[PDB]
Amino acid sequence: SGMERIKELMEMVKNSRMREILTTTSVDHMAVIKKYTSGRQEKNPALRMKWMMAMKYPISASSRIREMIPEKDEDGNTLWTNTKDAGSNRVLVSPNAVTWWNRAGPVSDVVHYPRVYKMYFDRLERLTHGTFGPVKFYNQVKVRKRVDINPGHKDLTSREAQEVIMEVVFPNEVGARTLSSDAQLTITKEKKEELKNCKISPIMVAYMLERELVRRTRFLPIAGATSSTYVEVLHLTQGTCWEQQYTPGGEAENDDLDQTLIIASRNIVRRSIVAIDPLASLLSMCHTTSISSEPLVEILRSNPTDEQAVNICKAALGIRINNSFSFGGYNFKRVKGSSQRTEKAVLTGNLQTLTMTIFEGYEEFNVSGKRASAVLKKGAQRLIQAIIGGRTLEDILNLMITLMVFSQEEKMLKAVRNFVNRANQRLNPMYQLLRHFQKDSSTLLKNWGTEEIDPIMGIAGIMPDGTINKTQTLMGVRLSQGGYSFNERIRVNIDKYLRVRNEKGELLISPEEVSEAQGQEKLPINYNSSLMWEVNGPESILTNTYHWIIKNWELLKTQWMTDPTVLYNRIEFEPFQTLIPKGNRAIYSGFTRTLFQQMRDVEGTFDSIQIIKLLPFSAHPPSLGRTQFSSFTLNIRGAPLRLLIRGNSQVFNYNQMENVIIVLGKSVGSPSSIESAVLRGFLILGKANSKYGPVLTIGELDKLGRGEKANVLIGQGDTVLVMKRKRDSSI
Amino acid sequence: VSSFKANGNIEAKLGAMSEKVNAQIESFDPRTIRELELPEGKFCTQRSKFLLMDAMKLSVLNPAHEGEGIPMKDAKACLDTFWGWKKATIIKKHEKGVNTNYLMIWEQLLESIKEMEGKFLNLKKTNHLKWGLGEGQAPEKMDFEDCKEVPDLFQYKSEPPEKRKLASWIQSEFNKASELTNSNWIEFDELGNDVAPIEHIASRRRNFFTAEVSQCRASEYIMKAVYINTALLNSSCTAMEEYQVIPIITKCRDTSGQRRTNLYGFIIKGRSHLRNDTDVVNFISLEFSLTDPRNEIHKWEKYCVLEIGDMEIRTSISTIMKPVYLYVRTNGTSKIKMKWGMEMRRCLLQSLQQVESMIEAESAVKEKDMTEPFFRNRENDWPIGESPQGIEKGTIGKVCRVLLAKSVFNSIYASAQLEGFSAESRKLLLLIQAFRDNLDPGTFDLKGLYEAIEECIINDPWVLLNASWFNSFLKAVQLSMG
Amino acid sequence: GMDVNPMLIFLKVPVQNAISTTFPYTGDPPYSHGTGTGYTMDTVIRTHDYSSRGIWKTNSETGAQQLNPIDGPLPEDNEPSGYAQTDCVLELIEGLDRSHPGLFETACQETIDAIQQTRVDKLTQGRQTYDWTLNRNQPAATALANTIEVFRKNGYKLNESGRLIDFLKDVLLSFENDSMEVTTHFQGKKRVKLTKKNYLIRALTLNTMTKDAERGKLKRRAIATPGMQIRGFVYFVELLARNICERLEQSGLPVGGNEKKAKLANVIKKMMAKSTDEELSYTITGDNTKWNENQNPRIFLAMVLRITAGQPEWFRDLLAVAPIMFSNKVARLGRGYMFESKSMHLRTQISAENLSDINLRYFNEDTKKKIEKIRHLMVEGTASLSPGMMMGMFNMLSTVLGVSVLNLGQREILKRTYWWDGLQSSDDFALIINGHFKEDIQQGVNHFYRTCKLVGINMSQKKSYINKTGTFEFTSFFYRYGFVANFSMELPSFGVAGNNESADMSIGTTVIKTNMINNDLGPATAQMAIQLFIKDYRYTYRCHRGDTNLETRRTKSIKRLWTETISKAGLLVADGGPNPYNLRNLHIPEVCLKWSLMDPDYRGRLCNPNNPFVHHMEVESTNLAVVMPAHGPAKSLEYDAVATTHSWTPKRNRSILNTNQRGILEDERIYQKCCQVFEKFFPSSTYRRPIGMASMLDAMLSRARIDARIDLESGRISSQDFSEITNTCKAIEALKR
RNA sequence: AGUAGUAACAAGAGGG
RNA sequence: ACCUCUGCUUCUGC
Numbered sequence A: 001s002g003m004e005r006i007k008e009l010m011e012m013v014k015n016s017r018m019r020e021i022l023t024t025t026s027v028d029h030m031a032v033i034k035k036y037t038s039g040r041q042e043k044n045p046a047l048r049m050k051w052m053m054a055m056k057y058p059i060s061a062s063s064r065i066r067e068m069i070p071e072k073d074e075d076g077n078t079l080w081t082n083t084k085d086a087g088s089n090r091v092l093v094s095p096n097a098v099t100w101w102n103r104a105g106p107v108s109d110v111v112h113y114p115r116v117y118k119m120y121f122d123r124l125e126r127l128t129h130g131t132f133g134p135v136k137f138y139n140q141v142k143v144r145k146r147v148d149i150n151p152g153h154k155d156l157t158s159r160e161a162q163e164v165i166m167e168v169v170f171p172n173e174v175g176a177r178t179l180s181s182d183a184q185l186t187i188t189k190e191k192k193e194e195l196k197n198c199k200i201s202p203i204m205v206a207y208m209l210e211r212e213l214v215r216r217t218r219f220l221p222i223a224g225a226t227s228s229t230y231v232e233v234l235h236l237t238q239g240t241c242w243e244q245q246y247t248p249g250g251e252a253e254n255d256d257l258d259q260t261l262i263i264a265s266r267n268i269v270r271r272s273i274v275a276i277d278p279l280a281s282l283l284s285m286c287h288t289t290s291i292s293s294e295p296l297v298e299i300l301r302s303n304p305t306d307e308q309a310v311n312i313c314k315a316a317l318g319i320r321i322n323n324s325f326s327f328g329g330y331n332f333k334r335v336k337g338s339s340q341r342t343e344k345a346v347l348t349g350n351l352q353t354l355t356m357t358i359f360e361g362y363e364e365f366n367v368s369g370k371r372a373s374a375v376l377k378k379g380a381q382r383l384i385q386a387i388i389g390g391r392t393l394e395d396i397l398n399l400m401i402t403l404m405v406f407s408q409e410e411k412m413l414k415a416v417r418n419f420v421n422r423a424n425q426r427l428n429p430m431y432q433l434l435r436h437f438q439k440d441s442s443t444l445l446k447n448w449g450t451e452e453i454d455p456i457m458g459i460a461g462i463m464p465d466g467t468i469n470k471t472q473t474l475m476g477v478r479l480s481q482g483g484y485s486f487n488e489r490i491r492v493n494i495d496k497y498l499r500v501r502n503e504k505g506e507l508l509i510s511p512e513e514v515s516e517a518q519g520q521e522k523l524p525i526n527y528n529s530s531l532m533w534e535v536n537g538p539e540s541i542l543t544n545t546y547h548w549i550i551k552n553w554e555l556l557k558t559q560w561m562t563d564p565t566v567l568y569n570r571i572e573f574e575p576f577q578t579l580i581p582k583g584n585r586a587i588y589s590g591f592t593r594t595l596f597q598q599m600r601d602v603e604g605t606f607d608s609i610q611i612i613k614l615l616p617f618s619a620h621p622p623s624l625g626r627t628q629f630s631s632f633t634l635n636i637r638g639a640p641l642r643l644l645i646r647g648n649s650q651v652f653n654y655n656q657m658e659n660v661i662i663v664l665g666k667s668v669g670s671p672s673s674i675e676s677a678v679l680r681g682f683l684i685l686g687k688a689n690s691k692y693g694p695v696l697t698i699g700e701l702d703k704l705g706r707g708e709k710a711n712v713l714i715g716q717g718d719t720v721l722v723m724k725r726k727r728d729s730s731i
Numbered sequence B: 001v002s003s004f005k006a007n008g009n010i011e012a013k014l015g016a017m018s019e020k021v022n023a024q025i026e027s028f029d030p031r032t033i034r035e036l037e038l039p040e041g042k043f044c045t046q047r048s049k050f051l052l053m054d055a056m057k058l059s060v061l062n063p064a065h066e067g068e069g070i071p072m073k074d075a076k077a078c079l080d081t082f083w084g085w086k087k088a089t090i091i092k093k094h095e096k097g098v099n100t101n102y103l104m105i106w107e108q109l110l111e112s113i114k115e116m117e118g119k120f121l122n123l124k125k126t127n128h129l130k131w132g133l134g135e136g137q138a139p140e141k142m143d144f145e146d147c148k149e150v151p152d153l154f155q156y157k158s159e160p161p162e163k164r165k166l167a168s169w170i171q172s173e174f175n176k177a178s179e180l181t182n183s184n185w186i187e188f189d190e191l192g193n194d195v196a197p198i199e200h201i202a203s204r205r206r207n208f209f210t211a212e213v214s215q216c217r218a219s220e221y222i223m224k225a226v227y228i229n230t231a232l233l234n235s236s237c238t239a240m241e242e243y244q245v246i247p248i249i250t251k252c253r254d255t256s257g258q259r260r261t262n263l264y265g266f267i268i269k270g271r272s273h274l275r276n277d278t279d280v281v282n283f284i285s286l287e288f289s290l291t292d293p294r295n296e297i298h299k300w301e302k303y304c305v306l307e308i309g310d311m312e313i314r315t316s317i318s319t320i321m322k323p324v325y326l327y328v329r330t331n332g333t334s335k336i337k338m339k340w341g342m343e344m345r346r347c348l349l350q351s352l353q354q355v356e357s358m359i360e361a362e363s364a365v366k367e368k369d370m371t372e373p374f375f376r377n378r379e380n381d382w383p384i385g386e387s388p389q390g391i392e393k394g395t396i397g398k399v400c401r402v403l404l405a406k407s408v409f410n411s412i413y414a415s416a417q418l419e420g421f422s423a424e425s426r427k428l429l430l431l432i433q434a435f436r437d438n439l440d441p442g443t444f445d446l447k448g449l450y451e452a453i454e455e456c457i458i459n460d461p462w463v464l465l466n467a468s469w470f471n472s473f474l475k476a477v478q479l480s481m482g
Numbered sequence C: 001g002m003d004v005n006p007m008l009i010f011l012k013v014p015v016q017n018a019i020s021t022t023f024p025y026t027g028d029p030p031y032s033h034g035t036g037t038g039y040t041m042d043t044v045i046r047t048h049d050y051s052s053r054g055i056w057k058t059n060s061e062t063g064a065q066q067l068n069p070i071d072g073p074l075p076e077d078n079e080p081s082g083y084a085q086t087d088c089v090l091e092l093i094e095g096l097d098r099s100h101p102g103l104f105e106t107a108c109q110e111t112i113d114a115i116q117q118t119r120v121d122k123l124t125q126g127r128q129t130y131d132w133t134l135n136r137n138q139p140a141a142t143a144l145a146n147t148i149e150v151f152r153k154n155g156y157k158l159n160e161s162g163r164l165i166d167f168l169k170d171v172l173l174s175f176e177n178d179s180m181e182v183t184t185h186f187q188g189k190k191r192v193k194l195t196k197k198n199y200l201i202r203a204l205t206l207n208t209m210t211k212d213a214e215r216g217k218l219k220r221r222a223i224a225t226p227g228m229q230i231r232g233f234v235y236f237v238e239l240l241a242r243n244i245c246e247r248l249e250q251s252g253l254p255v256g257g258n259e260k261k262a263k264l265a266n267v268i269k270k271m272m273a274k275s276t277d278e279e280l281s282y283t284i285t286g287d288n289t290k291w292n293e294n295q296n297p298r299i300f301l302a303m304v305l306r307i308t309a310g311q312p313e314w315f316r317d318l319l320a321v322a323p324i325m326f327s328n329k330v331a332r333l334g335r336g337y338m339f340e341s342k343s344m345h346l347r348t349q350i351s352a353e354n355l356s357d358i359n360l361r362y363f364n365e366d367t368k369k370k371i372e373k374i375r376h377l378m379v380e381g382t383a384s385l386s387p388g389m390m391m392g393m394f395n396m397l398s399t400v401l402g403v404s405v406l407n408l409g410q411r412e413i414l415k416r417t418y419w420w421d422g423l424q425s426s427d428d429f430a431l432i433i434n435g436h437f438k439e440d441i442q443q444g445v446n447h448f449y450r451t452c453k454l455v456g457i458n459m460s461q462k463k464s465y466i467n468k469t470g471t472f473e474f475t476s477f478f479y480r481y482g483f484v485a486n487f488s489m490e491l492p493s494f495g496v497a498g499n500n501e502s503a504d505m506s507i508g509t510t511v512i513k514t515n516m517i518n519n520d521l522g523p524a525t526a527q528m529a530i531q532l533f534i535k536d537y538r539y540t541y542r543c544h545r546g547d548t549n550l551e552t553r554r555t556k557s558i559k560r561l562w563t564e565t566i567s568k569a570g571l572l573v574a575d576g577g578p579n580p581y582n583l584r585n586l587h588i589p590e591v592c593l594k595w596s597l598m599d600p601d602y603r604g605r606l607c608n609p610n611n612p613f614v615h616h617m618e619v620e621s622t623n624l625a626v627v628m629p630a631h632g633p634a635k636s637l638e639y640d641a642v643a644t645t646h647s648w649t650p651k652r653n654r655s656i657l658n659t660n661q662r663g664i665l666e667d668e669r670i671y672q673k674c675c676q677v678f679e680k681f682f683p684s685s686t687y688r689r690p691i692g693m694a695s696m697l698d699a700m701l702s703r704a705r706i707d708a709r710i711d712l713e714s715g716r717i718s719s720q721d722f723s724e725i726t727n728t729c730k731a732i733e734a735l736k737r
Numbered sequence D: 001a002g003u004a005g006u007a008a009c010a011a012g013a014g015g016g
Numbered sequence E: 001a002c003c004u005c006u007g008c009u010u011c012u013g014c
């Protein structure tokens, strides 16, 4: 219509003030005058409301209330007055007016409410159809992470959501820029259809659409699954000392499932490699494990994920594999050659040390895709040459960039224009270098170079542009055609130690190639296995192992005294082994068992805390070693923690005052001057003594002799009198 | 700045700066530190807005009477249960007041109640009532130009508070506050039905909680505070020109289960044109007690106490007449104080969150819910008190009530003294903790820290007690160490 | 004879694990009564005392006495000192540049981009702001409006572009005016001409007042509010500093609670990994004393010039403005004092301005001494305050300074028998010092402390302490081998928020839920918190369940609604309904939770979009409350709620009706009228602010014309409407003429 | 008087 | 003596 609004305007413009304002206030300046006010933000709203709710007319309502409801109700209550609220034409009304309206006012229809407020109603749906398992009690470290908080988002940026909401709610006010993406367009169609004829305030529609469309996150202490449908009920599923097992109603994302499958498979592989029979152990865990009560076996049967650990599990189960990995949404299959993982430091174009892994060796790569394909060659941080094809030039673009990133070349390293987030958590390096060069090739292409390709009337070229050129191109870039048999899944076999070979006997995958990254599952994994602690996670491997030792201490102690080697070999210590760097397991064991023998040998120097502390490190065939250790390294979420041999550390300490052992900050309960189990082949006697010569490091005790007592900087600022023992202890 | 390049600039000036600029660490050993010094002066006196341990109630079991719920009607029904009235006399003078005026207010109140009709009661603005409620006591406001010449024109008194020292009554009140009564004081609104297992677990724990707390005398005070402050804020807002009477009522249930209405006395609200959130409403409180103030007058400095009747006690081998007193007081509060008093139920949360965290910590290590064990296997497993013999331990039930009482007293006796005392002493607590954890603690100006704590102990009875408590803790820790 | 002592629990329970009991936040916090003039004077005096050994100058433009302690004599004792050294500051900032290659350049480039993009209306965000046009505090937007208006009347209107930087240009150019004209309302309206000097003093003015409701302190303190001339310049300086702080792992700002906790944990972990097993490690739980009073504008000028080295001169000069203005600031001295006569039972107000020449007989000894010291600083009713940073505001930039000192502690820089790292957040810090022996620790602590002094940072020796690494405190976070909970900090947020019925329900359940997740609120206590909240809500809003016999102004109407409802379980609590909440559904909006249980007519009334109660303004401020935590500044709180008839708005304060400023209410009413009708033509302007130089009227006319045409050639409208509109448009067109 | 506590309230402002 | 208005609005920053 537009009938009454223009009449109003006419009316207003009759008035001189209003005409002046309307004629001398630009659209920009309207933003200022819209907020012009004498009213201030209430500094104590709780008090003010308590005060005002005692008053007859504390509520301010549109003046039209006066024609919409009676002045008084059946009971004699005045419902509205003609007093203008300060600064507006709203009037002062009673709360009785709100109730009146709610019993006797104009009934509306609410067909759009579920659709506009879908984000909210969906929460209730997921709960109404959720299932509760039981409550378990235990201590678990809840690590603070950024996590998603709104299920059902469309993964739009704030720009793209704005653009979409403008098209949906206010199409004629869009301006010049209209929607690129097909994701944007298909959302626009749907929403336009769902919300047609909608008479709810477009403010609420836009507000809700914005909340719903944009992925929002938050930093929270979270122990379990990090998916948004789990985050949403964190208050219900997780307490300080408890877990309420629960499954929300509705379907999981395929992305969350895939991600969890990879985490599960890696955990299983990593646990299995440290068992006496890895394949037997992996198969066992494959057959007992579930993700959200789905058997892992079924998932592995029907899930297309190609990943090293996943493929090891598939191999074990007789499932055919595609011996490929994904990178940036494109499937990669190495044709010929191989390379080597190497940890080295890299100065980028930002001017930044960032020391993640490199691939170093000859590797031919066939790369399938959505609408594109290519034949990338790679040496050591080299793009030996990438011939790319596709339906559109566009589809050749995405993959073009992806492949320059993937090369690891110095020309893309020194071409970027940080390595962590704000919480200082390390981020994905060879995926972020892609994200950057995604929305800005500019520098890369004009810092890559060009090439003068021969007439060879077939192999075209792409320039530092996107343009096509005849007998020039980028450094090692081509545009040709070629690329069904890439997707064919092959039958493989797998040996006791998880080596995967094709039917011709060629090595496809080895457990050591499996990424060492300890991720966090988006969905709950239940191993249901005697080989895995009931409580998942590396922190929990630590707390559970020590908790278990302590609670079984009487048995374990007598086993320590009578039958050491059986104790060392117990299966409960194998998960803990996965936290110890592979290269240290044997020497750490050797060191530990020797210290334990010295404790046995030198009577009256028993120490239960020292035994408990070091015991897990005994669980590996020991090697002979000279090396003295002041600490053992554990790797917890990609970061070394050091457990000190002598006394308390941040990782493991005994607190006198509580009389409890605290492990990564969690209590796991509790069970002469001579220390028999700190140095191999020495005793600590007590306080250092100037009347026994100067202070040596540990690594200078080297050349002492039986009976010969020194002063040592033993650790954490202490100096102690040691003595090289007269006899030895053997293992 | 644009061409600046550093070359030993910091190092040079460090080498030119006096060694008196330093942060020398002094080793911290709780065995060799002194107790906090408390202020000296007259003894501290009561400053709650209502009587605590000394309160007396007239009550009606299962009230039925016309208009059950209407405060004044309930009050009359409670009054009607008492037959021991008698001509009022003054037995303990408010030294600084016109004690005659207080007597006359009581008589006026009683008469006006006797004759009231309607649901509310506004008292006549007699001379005695206007005095008690500070009518006209604000100086007439004038332009400076018109009074700049008055000889005694002066800045408002802006000086440190008068100091007062600890007296035994505050500890005694605290003891009583943490004790069980045989009445349930808290009635809770409904929850949605329990569905999740954790909900069922929580409701079992919650019921143990209420069963420790609902009967706790601290919870009686909560209900007194919430009722008084709610009625006084509503009345303050709606009857700004009226001397409105507010009966002091709570309702409880016996352990038998029967409802009971309780009348403790009355409040008379003064005028209440409250603008700023600190602006004062004067009121008079008139509260029943069997306590004879003359035995402990320092507790009752601001009160005029009347003898108003006798109470028959009858073991039916004897029967004895117990004087009934009326504790009468001018007092004041503000919108900010009333608001917080209205919210005193939050004290339940501070206590129970702590208790629950203790149950949960143990549960984690035991890998099971330790609620029933904690509440049922009453070992004395928490130090919560001291006798002449030494440290006494109590059950988790006792802990819940002591922590509740602490929280409730923090609300009743909220002060800047308490704020600063709490924050500064907390550092000293943490230093002691660091010593006991073997973390080799050090200070930079311990003397300064002590002065920072001690200047906060001025005259407030609760702060004086909390300072005393810190010292007892320090001594106990010292005894357990050397 | 057993005496109960709750402190004895600490014999058994580690202090951090029962730390909640040391926080008395169930009682009302302390409030100031009356003037802040005494505290303001205090602060002004202290700030000068700490810098007293510097140089005095008279400002050419304002005549203000200005003390300069920079590059002054070096500290000689442990008292708070302002003798920061330019060369030492520059060394630290250079050290930080070295440690973060490209960081300054990037942060600068982001600021330049922001300068170009930022709209004038950005300044509409903010709280009470000194308004030089009124010589009074006003809301930010009103203060902005007033400055813009007075500017344009005096010939400054580069800001008509709509860009912030053009308003900044206007600000500087305004200082050339011989005679800025404003209008007072005599005690009516009247033209006042300010001298160039008067205007400049007002432009450089901080208003001062006392801080209420602060916890943990016996005594009150003064705070300050700057005006509009400075605010836009502060905006950009702090944006620059923010960009830098975000990339500093030692910055506590601007990350919030959980992320701050993550970053502290990280830094311990980092530190511990980087040390050797033979090193000792100690943590200082650290507080700076007299932070605001000892930081110096001149030093921040140096920091800004250094950080922006190599950048375009226009940008450098732009950023330098805020520091320069702060160097030349003055404080309003507050409301003055009240006096009283016992003999004559009277009382009177004197002004802070009166203090320049009032007879001193009226005052107590303390106050009289204050006034005597202040007099030499007074200029046109204000006190000169060149040193210090009373108003604060450079939170981010002072954090950069602190971090720069932390950054010095790397082993490769120091090459000593000790080294350090830590976290800095304004005037809180945690320092982790490592070395081989205790004497290395002491030396390192002395090195750190003395360096701090050389740049005007003063560690509080009374509030700080040191222990072996493992436990520490940082901004009422307590770490005992990992952060523990402090539930009591949050207790004040448990209650009825006082926004409206709808918002308060969602806020109340969300508070319980977030405390379960973050502050170890146990499930039993959480259930009780639901029950206690519901009760408080029912009493506050008088919305007791429809089957109850409590008498209020609302009870009769709610009972009717009750007796007339079939499905009573569908009634909102605010409509006399039952509480549906338990632990499992705290994250579900009430209206959603009861939707399927509601009588369709009730629902249809409740959710009628046509109702006259709801007050929608803007998408960007929808479902937003402001809450005041126990500690720290006021915060926006998002809540989830369906807009209903319970989403109402309480009435405005009416005290202005009795004042000279009552004309403002009418101006407000007009503007809203104009903005509302505008929104009938451009609905989208409630979502995204419209852009344009066109007048509001020309924009609306063009919209009406085109809308009527499409209406016609879509079928929606008849010709005998399309006539009426296009005609009405032409009348407006002419009436405009 | 009382509240309070470094300065305030114990009604303010306006009209007549 | 009456009449009228006001109850966060000369005072709450970052």
Ligand SMILES: CN1CN([C@@H]2O[C@H](COP(=O)(O)OP(=O)(O)OP(=O)(O)O)[C@@H](O)[C@H]2O)c2nc(N)[nH]c(=O)c21
Binding pocket: A325, A326, A327, A339, A359, A363, A378, A406, A407, A408, A430, A431, A515, A516, A517, A519
């Ligand atoms: C850059 N890449 C990527 N890539 C393989 O592709 C896999 C997936 O890449 P990614 O994004 O780093 O994922 P991933 O390593 O699984 O991540 P994470 O282990 O952190 O969970 C790598 O683990 C690696 O095996 C490579 N393989 C070879 N041969 N050469 C290369 O240059 C590269």
Ligand SMILES: [Mg+2]
Binding pocket: C287, C288, C289, C290, C291, C427
């Ligand atoms: Mg400070």
